[PDB]
Point group: C2
Chain length 306, copies 2
C-alpha cells in the first residue's frame, strides 16, 4: 500500500541523450538510430529569439558547424533537414545503446515522465500531466531545451515530448518528436497566451479510486447523481466535462472497489460544492489530476514479469 507520483525508470533514455552545439548555442538532443533530434532554435542566439527567420538562418552555418557529442566530442554530422520545429541530424553511426523506441502524439490529460537534462547529461526525472491548454508545469532551467518526455511499461520508449520554451509565466511548451507544437505556440519569444487551465476530471476520479483502495474513505457519498447535474457543476469550477468515454475507462476501478462511477461522481460534487474542510486525501489538501486511470491501475496488473 501507499501511493506516490511515480515516474518511469529512465535508463533506456539516459543512453539516448547527446548534446548539440551550433555556433555558440549548445543544447540537448535525442540520438536514435543514426539521427539526432533537437530544437531547431539551436541555430539562434540573441535578438534572433525575437523574430527568428528559421529558413534564412539555417542556410549558412553548414553541417560541420554542428557538433553532436555522446559522452565525448565524436559524432560526425553529415546531413540535416528541418522537420517543423525540430532539427534532424543525419549522422555517422548508430547509437550502441539505442533502445526499442517509437514516437507518439498524446492528448491533453495524459501523463508522462520528463528526463531533465543539461548539456547532454541527465539531471533528474519527474512525472507530469499535459494540461488541457497544452502546457506543462515543469521544472526547467536554461540549457534544458531538448529534454524529452516519454512513457514505458513495455520493451521500449514511447517518446511524446521535446522541451522548447518557457512562457512569460513559468509555464512550459514544447513539441512532439515530429516538431509540431502542442498547443498554439511558436518557437519565438514575443507574446503567447495559453488556456484557462482546467482540471482533468477523469484523473481526479481515478485518484479518488486509488484513495479508496488505500483506505482513505471519509469523503465517500452514497448519494448519487446524474451525468448532466454533475457536468453542470464540474464546469462552474473549471473542471473539464466527464463523458461516457471517461466512464468506460474507469470501469475496471469501479469493479475492484464496488463503487459505481456515477456514485464517485456524486462524491466529487460535494467536495466541489459543499466543503473540503482541509481534511486530507492521500497526502494532499486539494484534489489531484496528474494520475490517469492507467497510472492508478499500473500497480495491480503490470510493471514487471509474469
Amino acid at each position: 500500500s501507499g501511493f506516490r507520483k511515480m515516474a518511469f525508470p529512465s535508463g533506456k533514455v539516459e543512453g539516448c541523450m547527446v548534446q548539440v552545439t551550433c555556433g555558440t548555442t549548445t543544447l540537448n538532443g535525442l540520438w536514435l538510430d543514426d539521427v539526432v533530434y533537437c530544437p531547431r532554435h539551436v541555430i539562434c542566439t540573441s535578438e534572433d529569439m525575437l523574430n527568428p527567420n528559421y529558413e534564412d538562418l539555417l542556410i549558412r552555418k553548414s553541417n560541420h558547424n554542428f557538433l553532436v557529442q555522446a559522452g565525448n566530442v565524436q559524432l560526425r554530422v553529415i546531413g540535416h533537414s528541418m522537420q517543423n520545429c525540430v532539427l534532424k541530424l543525419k549522422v555517422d553511426t548508430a547509437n550502441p545503446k539505442t533502445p526499442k523506441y517509437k514516437f507518439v502524439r498524446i492528448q491533453p490529460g495524459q501523463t508522462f515522465s520528463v528526463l531533465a537534462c543539461y548539456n547532454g547529461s541527465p539531471s533528474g526525472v519527474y512525472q507530469c500531466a499535459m494540461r488541457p491548454n497544452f502546457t506543462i508545469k515543469g521544472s526547467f532551467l536554461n540549457g534544458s531545451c531538448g529534454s524529452v518526455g516519454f512513457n514505458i511499461d513495455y520493451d521500449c520508449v514511447s517518446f511524446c515530448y521535446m522541451h522548447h520554451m518557457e512562457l512569460p509565466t513559468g509555464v512550459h511548451a514544447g513539441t512532439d518528436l515530429e516538431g509540431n507544437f502542442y498547443g498554439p505556440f511558436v518557437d519565438r519569444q514575443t507574446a503567447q497566451a495559453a488556456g484557462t487551465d482546467t482540471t482533468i476530471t477523469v484523473n481526479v476520479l481515478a485518484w479518488l479510486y486509488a484513495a479508496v483502495i488505500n483506505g482513505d474513505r471519509w469523503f465517500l457519498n452514497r448519494f448519487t447523481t446524474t451525468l448532466n447535474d454533475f457536468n453542470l457543476v464540474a464546469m462552474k469550477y473549471n473542471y473539464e466535462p466527464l463523458t461516457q468515454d471517461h466512464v468506460d475507462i474507469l470501469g475496471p476501478l469501479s469493479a475492484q472497489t464496488g463503487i459505481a462511477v456515477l456514485d464517485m461522481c456524486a462524491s466529487l460534487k460535494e467536495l466541489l460544492q459543499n466543503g473540503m474542510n482541509g481534511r486530507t486525501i492521500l497526502g494532499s489538501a486539494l484534489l489531484e489530476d496528474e494520475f490517469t486511470p492507467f497510472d492508478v491501475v499500473r500497480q495491480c496488473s503490470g510493471v514487471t514479469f509474469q
Copy 2:
C-alpha cells in the same frame, strides 16, 4: 523556473537489480561486484514470518537452493553469509554493468530515490524522505522487497536503503546495506510501533526559500523572531527543533534571496500560529518537508557538466 519533486535518474541502478529465489520466495536483490544482497527473509514462507528463527532456517536450504537471475536464470551461487538482516551471496561473476557505487547510512530528514522493483525488473522511481521516526511513506506491493534507495549527482550510486516490510499501518521499514534496520524494527511480523512522526523543519524552510526564488512570495514576514520563541512554537505543532547547525546549512539560500533565516523562521511561525488560509505555495495547500536544502540548491550549481 518551476519546481518539482525530482528523482535521480535510475539508469545506474536498473542494471544492478537481480532476482533471488530460495524455495518458493523470490524477491529482488542488488548485484554489485560478485555479491548479491537481499533481505534475509527470502528464506522464509508462511508462519515463519510470525517468529522466524533465522539462524536455524538458514542452516539447511544450501547454496544451490538459491537462484539468482540477472535478466535470465544464469548466475551461480557458491557462497552465503548473513550480515545482520541482509543476505550476502558470493557468486560466480562480476556484473558487466556494475556502476561505481558505495554504501551509506543516512540520517532522518534526508531524501533519496527508490527504484520500486518486482521480481528483479524496475517498476518506477520516486523521491522521498526518511522520516524522523525511521519509516518511509512509500509505494510498495507484494514482491517489492529488496528494492533499494539511492542518491547520485556524482559518478556512481550512493546506496542507502533496502526495503524489507510494511508495518500494519501502511508505513514502510527497511535497512541500510549492512542490514541494520533504520529505527526500532525487526524483520518479523508481530506488533511494531514507530514514532510520532514530526515535520522536518529545516526542509520546510528550504522549501519556503524555493518558493521565493519561484516568485511565490505572499507569505513573507518582515517581522522577526528568536530561535527560542520559534522552537517553543514549532514544538507544540510537532515540528522538529531548528538548531544552529540547521541555520548554517541554510545560509547559501539566505544569501541568494536576501532573506535571513531567522526572518524566514519568523515567517514559518505565522503559517503555523495564525492561518494558512488555503492559499497555496508551489502547488501545495499544506507545508512540504521532503526537500532538503541541498535538493533545493540542486538546480543552481550541479546537475551535469561544467
